[PDB]
């Protein structure tokens, strides 16, 4: 027994064809089965033909004959159909409202999640459908991983380099850090974990969580977890207050955090507040400073990634009593300078998926662009807070959507929070970029920030751009532009200072060919988000949707504190680069 995701109408029916098996009310369960291919229906039992060796599952072709269900061919003489009269048969057959349109829930229930429009709907549908869609997407996502073949150690060529044999009659996953494997050791009568791993083309390079002497027979699968059901909404009901509520401001604050005193007061005067923090504007400085502004407040710092949480912990280590902080870790190496798993500690740093059930004076959810509506719902379920601050930048990168191929996901569709910031604007905005040369702040202020992002630093005069299409080669899942790496080799021989630069591209395979030919450290834009470097060399590689994504580009070029070279494929963003142009050797 449960709740009709459309009506809430109390009901004993779940769709057996929906991977999430939602509860549907007689009305909604009927409207769902007759308007889609979904015809298997689950109650306290499954509406299937309880006849010996009959394959009728379709609820529309079944009849209750006694207390046992039958199809047309096997039914007793006295039987009523299970699915007739605009209602399918179960408990609470008198309480049932329905809907004027079921169209949205059917699309959510049946879509394969390869179309942008599926994520658009999943973020514009009603709130109860946002949860249903978030479960349905995550389950489809965790299931699709199984469709990938096992990879098995055939030969250990060296250390940090392997030879994989792949399971036949299944595809192979892309070999980039968006796909994290788990190895296994062959035992008597089962298998034990041997740390998580990532792979890249040779043979294959592997960068594993723990070190080992792993040998032939050891195999690797993308570990897929059980998706729980969602209960809490993605945003609580908003409340605007006339005073600061349940928080006691400090009388004496430091000139380090004085630029955020107004914003900290705003945080105390609504239920939840959004903070758009562009690159190097001080998101973690803001987040930690909130604590010194509300000294007595209990604050739970949360984010999706361990990395994001650890950065909050690093910044905390510089400003808050260590004794009053705790890092929550479930039984991957993360921050280990606070007492571990101390829920009742005043300052709790913890990833979303590890959050305990607890209350807090304030909740800070950082790197919000990366959150999915799944995470939003989970936080609201685990954490009851007086205030919720959502810090990120809808102009930066979202969580990768492995299943998406048709259309681009716009920042208004990343999650409920990014939706507010791109529709009604953010509550709070960090308007000064302390990190980047002015050429780069001017470029992205125009590109994605409506000219409201100001440069602290002056022009570096070390920001360069070249228009070179070069020659694009494709491997199994990635792109390579060798002449663009050529041009960078030639730039480095004329400008050897730039050999302290990080290499950035939108493709791990470009990065691999760059590492070998140049010896610069490499990042993908996506792995580069949240990091800074004095000098950045960026090769666009292609003109794709992927390599022209304005949010990727915003992250690529805001990594530089001092100078950047951008080798561009796209005439569009090349022209939007307020950089010294350079001709081709
Ligand atoms: C203006 C400078 C000295 C860079 O600061 N010129 C170059 O180094 C250059 C020019 C065109 C192409 C390549 Cl590969 C390098
Ligand atoms: Zn269904
Ligand atoms: Zn219903
Ligand atoms: Zn039958």
UniProtKB/Swiss-Prot annotation:
LRR repeat intervals: 223-243
Domain (+)RNA virus helicase C-terminal: 431-585
Domain annotation CV ZBD: ranges: 1-112
Location of this chain's protein in the cell: Host endoplasmic reticulum-Golgi intermediate compartment
Occurrences of domain (+)RNA virus helicase ATP-binding (ranges): 252-430
Reported effect, residue 35 to P: In strain: Omicron/BQ.1.1, Omicron/XBB.1.5, Omicron/EG.5.1
Catalyzed reactions: ATP + H2O = ADP + phosphate + H(+)
Consequence recorded when altering residue 228 to I: In strain: Omicron/BQ.1.1
Binding, Zn(2+) 13: 49, 54, 71, 74
Consequence of changing residue 255 to Y: In strain: Epsilon/B.1.427/B.1.429
Binding site for Zn(2+) 12: 15, 18, 32, 38
Positions bound to a ribonucleoside 5'-triphosphate: 277-284
Sites where the protein binds Zn(2+) 11: 4, 7, 25, 28
Described purpose of this protein according to its UniProt entry: Plays a role in viral RNA synthesis. Multi-functional protein with a zinc-binding domain in N-terminus displaying RNA and DNA duplex-unwinding activities with 5' to 3' polarity. Activity of helicase is dependent on magnesium. Binds to host TBK1 and inhibits TBK1 phosphorylation; the interaction with TBK1 decreases IRF3 phosphorylation, which leads to reduced IFN-beta production.
Subunit composition and interactions: Interacts with nsp8 to form the replication-transcription complex (RTC): nsp12, nsp7, two subunits of nsp8, and up to two subunits of nsp13. Interacts with host TBK1; this interaction inhibits TBK1 phosphorylation and decreases by 75% IRF3 phosphorylation, which leads to reduced IFN-beta production.
Protein name per its UniProtKB record: Helicase nsp13
Organism name: Severe acute respiratory syndrome coronavirus 2
């Amino acid at each position: 027994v449960g709740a009709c995701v459309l009506c809430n109408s109390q009901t004993s029916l779940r769709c057996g064809a929906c991977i999430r098996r939602p509860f549907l009310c007689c009305k909604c369960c009927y409207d769902h089965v007759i308007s889609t291919s979904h015809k298997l229906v689950l109650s306290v039992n499954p509406y299937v033909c309880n006849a010996p060796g009959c394959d009728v599952t379709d609820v529309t072709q079944l009849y209750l004959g006694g207390m046992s269900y039958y199809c047309k061919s096997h039914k007793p003489p006295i039987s009523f159909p299970l699915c007739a009269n605009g209602q399918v048969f179960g408990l609470y057959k008198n309480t049932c409202v329905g809907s004027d349109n079921v169209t949205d829930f059917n699309a959510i229930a049946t879509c394969d999640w390869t179309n942008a429009g599926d994520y658009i709907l999943a973020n514009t549908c009603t709130e109860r459908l946002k949860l249903f869609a978030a479960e349905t997407l995550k389950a489809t996502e965790e299931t699709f991983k199984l469709s990938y073949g096992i990879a098995t150690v055939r030969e250990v060529l060296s250390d940090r380099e392997l030879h994989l044999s792949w399971e036949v009659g299944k595809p192979r996953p892309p070999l980039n850090r968006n796909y994290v494997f788990t190895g296994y050791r062959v035992t008597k009568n089962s298998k034990v974990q041997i740390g998580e791993y990532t792979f890249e083309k040779g043979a294959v390079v592997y960068r594993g969580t723990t070190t080992y002497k792993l040998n032939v027979g050891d195999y690797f699968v993308l570990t897929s977890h059980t998706v729980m059901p969602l209960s809490a909404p993605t945003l609580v009901p908003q409340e605007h207050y006339v005073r600061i509520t349940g928080l006691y401001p400090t009388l004496n604050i430091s000139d380090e955090f004085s630029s955020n005193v107004a914003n900290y007061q705003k945080v105390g005067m609504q239920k939840y507040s959004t903070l758009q923090g562009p690159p190097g504007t001080g998101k973690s400085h803001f987040a930690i400073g909130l604590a010194l502004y509300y000294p007595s407040a209990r604050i739970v710092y949360t984010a999706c990634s361990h990395a994001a949480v650890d950065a909050l912990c690093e910044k905390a280590l510089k400003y808050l009593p260590i004794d009053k902080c705790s890092r929550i870790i479930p039984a991957v190496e993360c921050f280990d300078k606070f007492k571990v798993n101390s829920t009742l500690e005043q300052y709790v740093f913890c990833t979303v998926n590890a959050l305990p059930e607890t209350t807090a004076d304030i909740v800070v959810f950082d790197e919000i662009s990366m959150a999915t509506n799944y995470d939003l719902s989970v936080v609201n379920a685990r954490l009851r807070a007086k205030h919720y601050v959502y810090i990120g930048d809808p102009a930066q990168l979202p969580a990768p959507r492995t299943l998406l191929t048709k259309g681009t996901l716009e920042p208004e569709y990343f999650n409920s929070v990014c939706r507010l910031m791109k529709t009604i604007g953010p509550d709070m905005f960090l308007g000064t970029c302390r990190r980047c040369p002015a050429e780069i702040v001017d470029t992205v202020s125009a590109l994605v920030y409506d000219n409201k992002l100001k440069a602290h630093k002056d022009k570096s005069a070390q920001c360069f751009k070249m228009f070179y299409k070069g020659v694009i080669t494709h491997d199994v899942s990635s792109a390579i532009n060798r002449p663009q790496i050529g041009v960078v080799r030639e730039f480095l021989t004329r400008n050897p200072a730039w050999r302290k630069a990080v290499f950035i591209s939108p493709y791990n395979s470009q990065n691999a060919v760059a590492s070998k030919i140049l010896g610069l450290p490499t990042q993908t834009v996506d792995s580069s988000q949240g990091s800074e470097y004095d000098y950045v060399i960026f090769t666009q590689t292609t003109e794709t949707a992927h390599s022209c994504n304005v949010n990727r580009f915003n992250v690529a070029i805001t990594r530089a504190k001092v100078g950047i070279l951008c080798i561009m494929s796209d005439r569009d963003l090349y022209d939007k680069l307020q950089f010294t142009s350079l001709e081709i050797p």
